Design a protein around this ligand. Structure first.
Ligand SMILES: NC(=O)c1ccc[n+]([C@@H]2O[C@H](COP(=O)([O-])OP(=O)(O)OC[C@H]3O[C@@H](n4cnc5c(N)ncnc54)[C@H](O)[C@@H]3O)[C@@H](O)[C@H]2O)c1
Ligand SMILES: NC(=O)c1ccc[n+]([C@@H]2O[C@H](COP(=O)([O-])OP(=O)(O)OC[C@H]3O[C@@H](n4cnc5c(N)ncnc54)[C@H](O)[C@@H]3O)[C@@H](O)[C@H]2O)c1
Ligand SMILES: NC(=O)c1ccc[n+]([C@@H]2O[C@H](COP(=O)([O-])OP(=O)(O)OC[C@H]3O[C@@H](n4cnc5c(N)ncnc54)[C@H](O)[C@@H]3O)[C@@H](O)[C@H]2O)c1
Ligand SMILES: NC(=O)c1ccc[n+]([C@@H]2O[C@H](COP(=O)([O-])OP(=O)(O)OC[C@H]3O[C@@H](n4cnc5c(N)ncnc54)[C@H](O)[C@@H]3O)[C@@H](O)[C@H]2O)c1
Ligand SMILES: CC(=O)NCc1ccc(-n2nc(C(N)=O)c(Oc3ccc(Cl)cc3)cc2=O)cc1
Ligand SMILES: CC(=O)NCc1ccc(-n2nc(C(N)=O)c(Oc3ccc(Cl)cc3)cc2=O)cc1
Ligand SMILES: CC(=O)NCc1ccc(-n2nc(C(N)=O)c(Oc3ccc(Cl)cc3)cc2=O)cc1
Ligand SMILES: CC(=O)NCc1ccc(-n2nc(C(N)=O)c(Oc3ccc(Cl)cc3)cc2=O)cc1
Ligand SMILES: [Mg+2]
Ligand SMILES: [Mg+2]
Lengths: 255, 252, 259, 256
C-alpha cells in the first residue's frame, strides 16, 4: 500500500548509487511503482548499479543527443511495459556541462561546449516529453531536476544558464503535456554530494544548511527523492509548469 | 492505509460545506488523520456543518483577533487530543477583508481601520496561530496556510491582495521559527473556488491553466494541502505551492 | 538639470542622514522646485532643510492623521501657486516599533504595534497618492522607498512584512495613477547607515551589511545614500517613461547574486 | 545632454525600425559619440539616417575572428587613448522552426542552438571583447522581454530570453571588476503573413498588453524603450547591475 501503487514510471539519469535518480528509483519502488530505467553510454556499469535497487527493472539505452534513440524510445518502452500499457510518470534526472562551462572563467567557455551542455541539460527535457507524451496516461506526471538559477553564483556559471533555460522549457512542456492530461514540473534541489571551484562549492553548501530553516543534509538525497515521488503521485493534481523547492527552505531566506 | 494515518491535525476556517477548510478536513479524514477543528463566532452553525464530515472531530472556538482565545488555544487542543499527545499538522484557512477593501469599492476609499482588521485576520493571524501551536507540535510537523498569488495586481481583490502579499512574507518568518521545532511552514496558492470582474478572472484562469481549472471543485486544493501535511515534501519550508492548474506560469 | 522646472513633493526628512534629505538635495541640484513635508518635529526639520542647497516650503504631514491628508492638496497648491501642479511625489516614510523590528522575537510583536507600522510604512503610500493625484500633471511620477522583502532575514521581521505589503500597494497605486498619466514605482535600496542592539543581534546585522558589499558585483557603500537618491531622481525624470507598478533596485546588484 | 561626451557602441541596427536605431538616435540627441556594429549581406544606408556620423564596424557574433579583433577595431574608430563608456546589445535571432507557428516540439536543436548563440551567449561574447576597453562607471545594456511565463508562438525565443537573463547576471559579476554595470531592458511588443490562427494569437498578446499596462502601451512607438536604455547608459542608475528594467507600460505588474 504505497504512494505510487500500480504506477508505471520511467526514470532516467542513474549513473552511480549516489545519483539522485538512483534514490528516486529506490523510493518509487518502495512505494509500489513499476519502473523502466534509461541509461547513457556506460550501460554494463549502469546495470551493475541498478542491480542494487530493491526490484528488477528493464534498462533501456538513451543518449538524449541521439535522434535515433529518441525516435525509438516510445516503442522500446512499450515493449518493456507491454502493449496496451502506458506510463504514468517520467523522471528527467539528466544534466551535463563541460568543465569549460563549470568549475574556468565564465568568458572562456566556447559555444560548442555551452551548446552541448544546454542540449543535454535543458532541450532534452522537451525531447523526452515529445517522445513519451504519446505513451502517457491522463493524470500522468513529468518531473525534471533543477536548481534555483534566479541569482548568479560562483563556479556553476553556464550550468546555471542551462537551468534558467530548463525552467523556461518546463513552462512550455506544461502547455503540451496539458493536452494529454499530464503535469510537467521541476524539483529545485539543494546541493547533494553525488560526485577556485572547490572553495566556491564549500562556501555554497555551508551557506545552505545555515540558510535552510529546517536544515540541509548534503549527503542525503532521500528528501529530494520523496519530493519527486510526491509530484509523481496523485497528491499535487493541480500543479503544472511549476517548480517545487526541495532545498530546506534556503531559497526563502537571505541569511 | 492513508496518506495521513495516525496524524493529529488542527483545521481552522470551516464556515460552510463549500469552505476550502471543509474539503481539506474531509480529504484529511479520508486519509486517516485525526482532526481538531476551530471555528469563529457562529459555533453552533459550524458544529452542524462539521456533522457533514465523515468522522467526528472536536470543535474549538477561535477568533484570531481575541488574545485570550490564542492564549488558551494550546491547552484547549491538548484537552481535545489528550495529555501527552501533540499535533502533527495545522491548517490556517482564515481570511477576511471588509467590503470597503475588497469588491467594487475604489481601492483609495478603504479606511485604515478596515484594512487593519483584514490584515490582522488574513496575515498576522498566521504568525499568531504558529506562536500558539508550535509548543504543542511534533518534529516533522507541518503548518499550511491558504493563499492566492498576489505578485501582480488585479481588479476588485484590492486590499485582500495586499493582505496576501503580507501573508507570504509572514510565512517566510514563521518558517524560521517553526524550523527550531523541526516543523515546516508553507502556503498553498489556489486558483479561484466558488465558496462580472470575478467571472472574468475565473474565465481567464481556466484558459491560462495548461491542465484547466474547475472553479466549482476544491478537491485538488484540499489534496495539495494534504500533500504538504504528509511526510512527502520534507525539505520544503517558507514556501508557496501553487494549486492553480499552472495558470500563474502562463501569460496567455 | 535632469529635473529642470519640475515641481516635486518630498516627504520623510527627519535628519540630514535621511534618504529623503539626499533625494531632496539631488533633486534641487538637478533644477527641481520642491515642497517638503515633515512629521511632528517641524522646528527641528526646518533647521535640517536649511542645510539643503535651496529654500523650500515645509508642510506638516502626519500620515496617520486624516485631517492632514484631507487638507494636503490645498496646502500644496497654496505653496506652489494656484494653477500649478506637481510633477513628482516622493514617499520616504517608514516606521516599525522596536517590538516589530530589532531584537524582539518575531512572535512577540503585538498587533497594535505591527498595525501602526503597516499604516505608516505601506498604507500611507496609497493615502499620499489619493491626496496628491488630483494635483499631479500627466507624465508625473510617484516614488516610494522599499527594500527587497522577497526573502526573510534576521531582525527586520515585521518591517519586512510591511515592505511586502508596500510592494503590493505600489502595484494598485499604479492602476489608479495611470488614469492621470502618472507612474508609481518603488526604489529597493541596500542598507544605509541613516553596540545598542547587544553582541548577538549586532553580529547578525553586521553580517547582513558585509554580505551586501560581498554580493554586489559593483560593491555597496552603506555610508552613502547618493546612489539611491540618484535612482529616485531617474524615476522622477522623463527617462523611464514606460515603467510603472514596478521596483528598481539600487542595491549594487546584491539581489541578483546568491553569493 | 544625458550622455554628453560618452562613447557608446550600439549593435543591432538592420532597419530604421530596429530598436537599436531608436536607441542610437536618442543617444546622439543626448550628446553621445557612437560606434555602430552590424551584420548583413547595406546597413550604412540605414546608419546614414541617424542625426550624426558614426563609424560602422562589421560584427557577426557567431564569428570568433570578428570578436577577437573587435576591441582593436573599436579603438581605431574612437582614437588611441580613448575607451567606451557604454555598450548596447540589441541582437536577437530565432529560426521560424523555433518561433512562430511551428509546434514547440518540432524545433530541431541545431536551429534552437543557433538562436541561443546569437540571442543569449553573444551577450557574454560582446562583454568579453569590450570590457577591456571600457571606462569605470561604464554600462552594458541588452534587450530582453519578460520570459518568466510561457506564451503562444515565441516558444524557443522565450527560452533564449530566459537564458539571456541568466547570462546578464553572470556578465554583471565580470563587469563589476571593471566598475561597469550590466543590465537588460525588458520591453513590451514593438512593431519593428502568419495566417488567421497565429495572427489572432499575436493580436490578443498586443491588445492584452495595452489593457494590462496602467499607462497603456503603444506598440508603434520604440522611443520609450530607447529612452529607458539611455537612462541605463547614463550616470543616473549607478547602483543597478545584473538587473532587468521593464519598459513595458507596467504590464508585467498586472494580472488583468
Ligand atoms: N547533485 C546536486 O547537487 C544537484 C542539485 C540540484 C539539481 N541537480 C540535477 O539533478 C540531475 C542529476 O544530477 P546528479 O547530481 O544525480 O548527477 P549524476 O551525475 O549522477 O546524474 C547526471 C546524469 O545525466 C546523465 N547524462 C549526461 N549526458 C547524458 C546524455 N547525453 N543522455 C542521457 N543522459 C545523460 C548521466 O549519465 C547521469 O546519469 C542533473 O540535472 C543535476 O543538474 C543536482
Ligand atoms: N475561495 C477562493 O477562491 C480562494 C482562493 C485562494 C485562497 N483562498 C483563501 O482560502 C482561505 C479560506 O477561504 P474560503 O474560500 O474557504 O472562504 P470561507 O469564507 O469559507 O473561509 C474563510 C474563513 O475565515 C474565517 N474567519 C474570519 N474571521 C475570522 C476570525 N476573526 N477568526 C478566525 N477565523 C476567521 C471565517 O469564519 C471562515 O471560516 C482564505 O484565506 C482565502 O483568502 C480562497
Ligand atoms: N538602510 C536604510 O536606511 C533603508 C533601506 C531601504 C529602504 N529604506 C526606507 O527608506 C525610507 C526612509 O528611511 P530612512 O532610512 O531615511 O530613515 P528616516 O528615519 O530618516 O526616515 C523615516 C521618515 O519617516 C517619517 N515618518 C514616520 N512616521 C511618520 C508619520 N506618521 N507621518 C509622516 N512621516 C512619518 C519620519 O519622520 C522620517 O522622516 C523608509 O521607508 C525606509 O524603510 C531605508
Ligand atoms: N520588437 C519587439 O517587440 C521586441 C520586444 C522586446 C525585446 N526585443 C529584442 O530587441 C532586440 C532587437 O530586436 P528588434 O525588434 O529591433 O529587431 P531587429 O530585427 O531590427 O534587430 C535584430 C538585430 O539582430 C541582428 N543580428 C542577428 N544575427 C546577428 C549576428 N549573427 N551577429 C550580429 N547581429 C546579428 C540583426 O542584424 C538585427 O540588427 C532583440 O534582441 C529582440 O528580441 C524586441
Ligand atoms: C559533469 C556534469 O555536468 N555532471 C552532472 C552534474 C552537473 C551538476 C550537478 N550539480 N551539482 C551540484 C553540487 N552538489 O555541487 C549542484 O549544487 C547546487 C548548485 C546551486 C544551487 Cl542554487 C543548488 C545546488 C547543482 C548541480 O546541478 C550535478 C551533476
Ligand atoms: C468577505 C470575506 O473576506 N470572505 C472570506 C473570503 C475572502 C476572499 C476569498 N477569495 N475569493 C476568491 C474568489 N474565488 O472570488 C479568490 O479568488 C482569487 C483571486 C485572485 C487570485 Cl490570484 C486567485 C484566486 C481569492 C480569495 O481569497 C474567499 C473568501
Ligand atoms: C524606527 C523606524 O521605523 N525608523 C525608520 C526606519 C525604519 C527602517 C529603516 N531601515 N533600516 C535599515 C538599516 N538598518 O540599514 C534597512 O536595511 C536593510 C534591511 C534589509 C534589506 Cl533587504 C535592505 C536594507 C532597511 C530599512 O528599512 C530605516 C528607517
Ligand atoms: C527573425 C528574427 O529572429 N528577428 C529578430 C527578432 C526576434 C524577436 C523579436 N521580438 N518580436 C516581438 C514582437 N513584437 O512580435 C516581441 O514581442 C514580445 C513577445 C513577448 C513578450 Cl513577453 C514581450 C514582447 C519580442 C521579440 O523578441 C524581434 C526581432
Ligand atoms: Mg562585491
Ligand atoms: Mg491599460
Amino acid at each position: 500500500t504505497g504512494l505510487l501503487d500500480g504506477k508505471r514510471i520511467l526514470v532516467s539519469g542513474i549513473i552511480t548509487d549516489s545519483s539522485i535518480a538512483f534514490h528516486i528509483a529506490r523510493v518509487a519502488q518502495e512505494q509500489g511503482a513499476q519502473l523502466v530505467l534509461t541509461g547513457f553510454d556506460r550501460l554494463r556499469l549502469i546495470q551493475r548499479i541498478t542491480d542494487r535497487l530493491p526490484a528488477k527493472a528493464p534498462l533501456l539505452e538513451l543518449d538524449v543527443q541521439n535522434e535515433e534513440h529518441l525516435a525509438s524510445l516510445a516503442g522500446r518502452v512499450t515493449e518493456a511495459i507491454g502493449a496496451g500499457n502506458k506510463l504514468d510518470g517520467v523522471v528527467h534526472s539528466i544534466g551535463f556541462m563541460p568543465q569549460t562551462g563549470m568549475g574556468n572563467p565564465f568568458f572562456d567557455a566556447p559555444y560548442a561546449d555551452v551548446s552541448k551542455g544546454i542540449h543535454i541539460s535543458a532541450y532534452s527535457y522537451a525531447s523526452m516529453a515529445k517522445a513519451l507524451l504519446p505513451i502517457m496516461n491522463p493524470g500522468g506526471s513529468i518531473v525534471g531536476m533543477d536548481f534555483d538559477p534566479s541569482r548568479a553564483m560562483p563556479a556553476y556559471n553556464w550550468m546555471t544558464v542551462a537551468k534558467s533555460a530548463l525552467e523556461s522549457v518546463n513552462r512550455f512542456v506544461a502547455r503540451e503535456a496539458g493536452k494529454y492530461g499530464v503535469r510537467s514540473n521541476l524539483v529545485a534541489a539543494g546541493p547533494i554530494r553525488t560526485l577556485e571551484a572547490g572553495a566556491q562549492i564549500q562556501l555554497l553548501e555551508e551557506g545552505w544548511d545555515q540558510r535552510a530553516p529546517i536544515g540541509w543534509n548534503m549527503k542525503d538525497a532521500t528528501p529530494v527523492a520523496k519530493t519527486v515521488c510526491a509530484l509523481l503521485s496523485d497528491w499535487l493534481p493541480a500543479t503544472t509548469g511549476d517548480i517545487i523547492y526541495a532545498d530546506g527552505g534556503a531559497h526563502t531566506q537571505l541569511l
